[PDB]
Amino acid sequence: MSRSNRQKEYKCGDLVFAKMKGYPHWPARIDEMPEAAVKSTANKYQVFFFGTHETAFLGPKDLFPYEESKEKFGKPNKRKGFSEGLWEIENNPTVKASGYQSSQKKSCAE
Structure with missing residues (x-):
């Protein structure tokens, strides 16, 4: 079966x-x-x-x-906000993250 021989794949960190x-x-x-x-x-x-x-x-x-x-x-x-993305993808493609959990069992600051 020849139905368009194409199989692309992306990975974490890839710019798309x-x-x-x-x-x-x-x-x-x-x-x-x-x-x-x-x-x-x-x-x-x-x-x-x-x-x-x-x-x-x-x-x-x-x-x-x-x-x-x-x-x-x-x-x-x-x-x-679109343009702002142009600068980031080039100046910092790793900007922002998923987030971290501060204080799980006890807190000191607040």
Whole structure:
């Protein structure tokens, strides 16, 4: 069966663009791979949207090579905050994180 011989794959730390309905490709990066077959996650991933530092789940069909689409998707937008992402993806692709839990058993400061 010859049905378009193409099988791409992304990994944590990879710089890609995520397409959303009503919005243009937003500069993003991979933060985690798919579990296996749990919850309502067919083949999505946790991508980080620079500028706003927001995260969401999208499939590979909605993800594209940043460097490759940088010139096409790397341009200011009316949604505001888009440009801010351009600077981050270039100046700091590892900006922001998942978050840490301060004080679990006891606290000292507050």
